[PDB]
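Teaching note: in complex prediction, the entire set of molecules is handled at once rather than each chain in isolation. The prompt given to students was simply: 'Predict the structure of this complex.' The entities are:
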Amino acid sequence: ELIGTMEQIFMNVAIFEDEVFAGVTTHQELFPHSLLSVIANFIPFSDHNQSPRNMYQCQMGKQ
Amino acid sequence: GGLTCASAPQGTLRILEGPQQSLSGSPLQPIPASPPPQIPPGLRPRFCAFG
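The expected output is the structure of the full assembly:
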């Protein structure tokens, strides 16, 4: 389903399959790192380093 | 051909197509969990200490 910008303030999407419940959860993201850009995916182990390190790596790789 | 007026209608039946039944299944169909990474089979020490 192509959820748009205003639908997903009223939809209960879920990230993981375990977080899907009965009656509450109505959608699910495709793969759980979908919230990240193309360049910020290319960072290895993004969930372990701090956030300005990632925001600085995204402008290292473009230099 | 005079077309005189009549009284007030009591109720107004609204005909509309029915709700989409049997569209959603009674269990849900989630994307399956991506598997946790395995230690691959056939791992051995390939580096021998020199001399």
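Point out the following to students. The interface with chain B takes residues 14, 16-18, 20, 22, 25, 28, 30-32 of chain A (CB under 8 Å). Chain A has two helices and no strands.
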